[PDB]
Amino acid sequence: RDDIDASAVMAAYLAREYAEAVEEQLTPRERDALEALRVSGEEVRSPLLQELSNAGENPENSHIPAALVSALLEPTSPGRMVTAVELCAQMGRLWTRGRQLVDFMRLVYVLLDRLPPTADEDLGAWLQAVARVHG
């Protein structure tokens, strides 16, 4: 049990150091948005990928999340944008061991490369929508 998954340790380190750095700069309303994404993150977006990845410890099937993200961001809606983000976070929770890190990074890249310019406005719109409906 002295074996070290270098890829895993390095990814965890960099992810936390970047997460904490960004969080320190966020505005109060940006912080409210982050919490809302956490709350929405507990609603499983793809139970099929939850079960399939519950199995294992092909690469063709590791592409399904990226294809779904791209499909969600293709004439899109704020809801589909948040849904794409939440799907990525949820695959992150399953794709923790070293050899899966490659698939996870592609997934996030597909996400952030295919966002709309209206993302800043749409996320503000989504936040106020969920707040007004649930508040």
Annotated binding residues, written as ranges, equal 2, 13, 23-24, 57, 113
Longest alpha-carbon distance in the chain: 51
Handedness of CA 71, 88, 114, 58 (dihedral sign): negative
Do residues 37 and 82 make contact, with C-beta atoms less than 8 angstroms apart?
A: yes
Report the residue from 97, 99, 129, 131 that binds its own copies according to the rule CB under 8 A: 97
User: Applying CB under 5 A, which residues contact Na ion?
Assistant: 7, 28-29, 46, 48, 73, 76, 98-99, 116, 130, 133
**Nearest distance in Å: CB 30, Na ion:** 9
CB nearer to Mg ion: pick between 76 and 90: 90
**Nearest distance in Å: CB 45, Na ion:** 7
Could you say whether residue 131 binds Cl ion (CB under 5 A)?
A: yes
Report which residue type is found at 45.
R
Handedness of CA 65, 69, 71, 77 (dihedral sign): positive
Could you say whether residue 131 binds its own copies (CB under 8 A)?
A: no
Burial class (CB in 10 A: 0-12, 13-18, 19+), 106: middle
> Which of Mg ion, its own copies, Na ion, none lies near 131, with the C-beta cut-off 5 to 8 A by kind?
none
Residues near Cl ion (CB under 5 A) are 90, 93, 131, 135
